[PDB]
C-alpha cells in the first residue's frame, strides 16, 4: 500500500498547489509599485565592539536595546554595553565550538550552544556575582544551530538532527519535541506573541509550529537550497528567509505561500543571517561576500549596503526599539550601525 | 565621570586584561587539527602513545606535543551523516588529518569522493590536508593474496606503473608497492587537479602499529606554516 499512500500524498500536494494559486490574485510587486521608494539608506558604524580574539559566530540583543551578547570560537561569551562599549561580562565556555547564543527577555539569563549538542544556560543575576552554569539541556542528537528564550523557564532550541525541541529549564527536560524536517534545522524565529515559531532547515522547507500543541501547522517551500536564516515580520503574519542560493524570500502565513524573492543576478553568495527593521520596511541580510545588504521588503529593491566587514558576516540583529543594527563577522569585530 | 561610570570602566578594563591573559595562555604554540575518516579507517589509532580520549557530548579531543609544540586534534563522531554545515566551523585548523583504509577497495571511491569534496570546499580550500593511508599492512596482505583484484574497482590500474620516485621497503613486493603508490597517486590527482597553491596534500603510508604519526604531523605542520609564512612574505 506504499504506492497508494504515495499517490494520495501527491494528490494532496496537487490540491495544495491549486489552492494557493487561486489565492494568488495578484502580486505585492504590482500592488506596491505606486508607493514612494524609501530612497538610499546609508548607515555608518557608530561603535565597533573590539575584544574578541577569534571569529564571532552569533549574537543576540537585549530587550532593553542596550546590552548585547556575542559568541566566538575562542571560548568566550561576552556581554557588551553598546552605548559605551563596556564589557559587562566575559563567560568562559567549556567548548569553543559555539554556534549560537541568546539573551533572555528578562535579561537575567543568557544561553549558548553549538557542536557540543548541549544548550548551556548562564545566570547573570546570581547573588555570588560570578556567572555560573545554570543548566545543561542535554538530549539533542545534533549540533545546536539556534536557540531563543520564550520566558525565564522555557527555551526553544533547534538542532542538526532535523528536530526542534522545547525545554523546561527548571527540570531540564524536553516539554515538547517538534519533528517533520528532513534536513538539519539552522534557524528559528519566535513570534511577537510567543505562540508560534518557524524553523528554516537544510531541506529548503520552512515550517510553522504551534508551541502548545507541538504540531506543524504549515510548511513553506520556494527555496532551492539550504536555509540558514529566518525572521518573523513585526506583524507576525509573515517571515523572511535566507538561503544558500543567494536569495531571500518572504512567506505569508495566511496566504500560505511566497510573496517576494529578494535576489539579483549579481548575487552568488549565500545568506548567513536576516533581520527586519522596526516597521518591517527594511530587510537586512548578511551574505558570505563580507557584506550586508538592506532590502526594501515591499518593493524588493536594494536600498543600501553595510560594507565595512573584512571577513564573512555570520550574525546580524536589530534592536527592539529599532535604533541600531549590530553586525558580527569572522574578522572578530562586532559593529553597530545607525 | 560619575562613580557608576568609573566602576563600569574599571570592570571593563579588568575583564579585558583577564581576556588578554587567557588569550596569551594556552593559545601560543598550539595548533588545532580536524581528524576525519570512516568507520573502517583507524582514525582513533593514529596517535598511540598520546591518544587522549576526552569524550563528554559528541566530540572527543586528543592533545599531544612533539617538541614543545602542542597539537589539539578534534574528532566529531556523534553527528548525523550530513556534514556540509558542521564542517564550516573547522576553517581555522592548520591541517586536516584524513585517514583512509587503503585495504578495502569497495569504500575507496567513497573516501576519494569525500576527499574531493573537502579539497574543493569553499571554507576548506585554504586548509592543507594531511593524508594517512592506513592499514598498509592489510593492503599488502590483500594484494599478496590476490583473491580480490583492484582492477575491478579501478580499471586504470591495468595501465599504471610504479613511479621512479617510489621508495619501497626491501621486503615490499613490486605488486604491493605499485598498489599502494597507485592509491596515493589517485588521491594526489584529486589534490593537484584543483590545488589552489595555498593548501597542499601530504600523503603518508601508515599502519596500525606505526608510532611515527605524531612526528609526521609535526613535520607536516612545520611545512604548512613555513609555506604560509613564505606566501605572506612574498617568498613563495
Amino acid at each position, epitope marked *: 500500500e506504499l504506492d497508494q499512500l504515495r499517490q494520495e500524498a501527491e494528490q494532496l500536494k496537487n490540491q495544495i498547489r491549486d489552492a494557493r494559486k487561486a489565492c494568488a490574485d495578484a502580486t505585492l510587486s504590482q500592488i506596491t509599485n505606486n508607493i514612494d521608494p524609501v530612497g538610499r539608506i546609508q548607515m555608518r558604524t557608530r561603535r565597533t565592539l573590539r575584544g574578541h580574539l577569534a571569529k564571532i559566530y552569533a549574537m543576540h540583543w537585549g530587550t532593553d536595546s542596550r546590552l548585547l551578547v556575542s559568541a566566538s570560537q575562542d571560548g568566550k561569551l561576552i556581554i557588551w554595553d553598546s552605548y559605551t562599549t563596556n564589557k559587562v561580562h566575559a563567560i568562559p565556555l567549556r567548548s569553543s565550538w559555539v554556534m549560537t547564543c541568546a539573551y533572555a527577555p528578562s535579561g537575567n539569563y543568557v544561553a549558548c550552544g553549538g557542536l557540543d549538542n548541549i544548550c548551556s544556560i548562564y545566570n547573570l543575576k546570581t547573588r555570588e556575582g560570578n556567572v555560573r552554569v545554570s543548566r545543561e539541556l542535554a538530549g539533542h542528537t545534533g549540533y545546536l544551530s539556534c536557540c531563543r528564550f520564550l520566558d525565564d523557564n522555557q527555551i526553544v532550541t533547534s538542532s542538526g538532527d532535523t528536530t526542534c525541541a522545547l525545554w523546561d529549564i527548571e527540570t531540564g527536560q524536553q516539554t515538547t519535541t517538534f519533528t517533520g524536517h*528532513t534536513g538539519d534545522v539552522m534557524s528559528l524565529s519566535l513570534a511577537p506573541d510567543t505562540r508560534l515559531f518557524v524553523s528554516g532547515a537544510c531541506d529548503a522547507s520552512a515550517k510553522l509550529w504551534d508551541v502548545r500543541e507541538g504540531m506543524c501547522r504549515q510548511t513553506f517551500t520556494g527555496h*532551492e*537550497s539550504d536555509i540558514n536564516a529566518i525572521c518573523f515580520f513585526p506583524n507576525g503574519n509573515a517571515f523572511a528567509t535566507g538561503s*544558500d*542560493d543567494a536569495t531571500c524570500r518572504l512567506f505569508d502565513l495566511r496566504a500560505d505561500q511566497e510573496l517576494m524573492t529578494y535576489s539579483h543576478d549579481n548575487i552568488i553568495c549565500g545568506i548567513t543571517s536576516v533581520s527586519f527593521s522596526k516597521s518591517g520596511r527594511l530587510l537586512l541580510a548578511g551574505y558570505d561576500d563580507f557584506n550586508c545588504n538592506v532590502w526594501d521588503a515591499l518593493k524588493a529593491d536594494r536600498a543600501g549596503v553595510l560594507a565595512g566587514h573584512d571577513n564573512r558576516v555570520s550574525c546580524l540583529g536589530v534592536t527592539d526599539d529599532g535604533m541600531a543594527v549590530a553586525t558580527g563577522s569572522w574578522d572578530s569585530f562586532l559593529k553597530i550601525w545607525n | 565621570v560619575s562613580a557608576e561610570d568609573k566602576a563600569a570602566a574599571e570592570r571593563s578594563k579588568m575583564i579585558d586584561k583577564n581576556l588578554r591573559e587567557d588569550g596569551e595562555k594556552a593559545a601560543a604554540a598550539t595548533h588545532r587539527l580536524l581528524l576525519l575518516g570512516a568507520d573502517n579507517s583507524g582514525k582513533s589509532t593514529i596517535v598511540k602513545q598520546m591518544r587522549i580520549y576526552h569524550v563528554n557530548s559528541g566530540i572527543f579531543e586528543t592533545k599531544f606535543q612533539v617538541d614543545k609544540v602542542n597539537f589539539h586534534m578534534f574528532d566529531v563522531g556523534a553527528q*548525523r551523516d550530513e556534514r556540509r554545515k558542521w564542517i564550516q566551523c573547522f576553517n581555522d585548523v592548520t591541517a586536516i588529518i584524513f585517514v583512509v583504509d587503503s585495504s578495502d577497495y569497495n569504500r575507496l571511491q567513497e573516501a576519494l*569522493n569525500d576527499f574531493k569534496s573537502i579539497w574543493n570546499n569553499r571554507w576548506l580550500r585554504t586548509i592543507s590536508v594531511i593524508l594517512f593511508l592506513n592499514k598498509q599492512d592489510l593492503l599488502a596482505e590483500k594484494v599478496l593474496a590476490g583473491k580480490s583484484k583492484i582492477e575491478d574497482y579501478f580499471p586504470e590500474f591495468a595501465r599504471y606503473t610504479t613511479p621512479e620516485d617510489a621508495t619501497p621497503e626491501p621486503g615490499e613486493d613490486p605488486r604491493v608497492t605499485r598498489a599502494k603508490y597507485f592509491i596515493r597517486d589517485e588521491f594526489l590527482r584529486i589534490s593537484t587537479a584543483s590545488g589552489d597553491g595555498r593548501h597542499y596534500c601530504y600523503p603518508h603510508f601508515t599502519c596500525s602499529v606505526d608510532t611515527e604519526n605524531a612526528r609526521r604531523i609535526f613535520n607536516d605542520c612545520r611545512d604548512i606554516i613555513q609555506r604560509m609564512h613564505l606566501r605572506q612574505y612574498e617568498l613563495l
Partner: nanobody
Amino acid sequence: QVQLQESGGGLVQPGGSLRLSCAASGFTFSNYKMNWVRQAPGKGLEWVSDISQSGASISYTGSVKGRFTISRDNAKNTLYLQMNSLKPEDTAVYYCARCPAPFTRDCFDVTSTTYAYRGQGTQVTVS
C-alpha cells in the same frame, strides 16, 4: 518546490541497455551539479557518476567506468544515464541527486541516508 523524478528502469537481460531520465523542477538546473547514486539490495548508497554545470567535467565509478554515459540537457531540465552493456551486478535503485549549493565544485552529502535533494527512485532489475 524542489523535486526530482527519474524514469526508465524495468527488467532487462545482461548486456542490455537502458535510459534513465531524471526530471527536475522548482530550481535552476544549470547552476547545480548532478550525481547518480544507487542502492544495491542490502547495501548502502553508492555514487555512480557525476557531471559539472557545463557538462565538460564527467566522472564515473570504477565499476561502471567505460559503460555508463551521463548527459545533461540544460534546456529541457533533464539528466540522462545511458547504461550500456550492463550486468546483473548492476541491480539497484537509482537516484538523481543534485549537489546542495549552486556554483560549487564539492558535493558533500549526496549519498547520505536522508539527503533532502534526492529523487524517489527507479527500480532497475537484471536477470
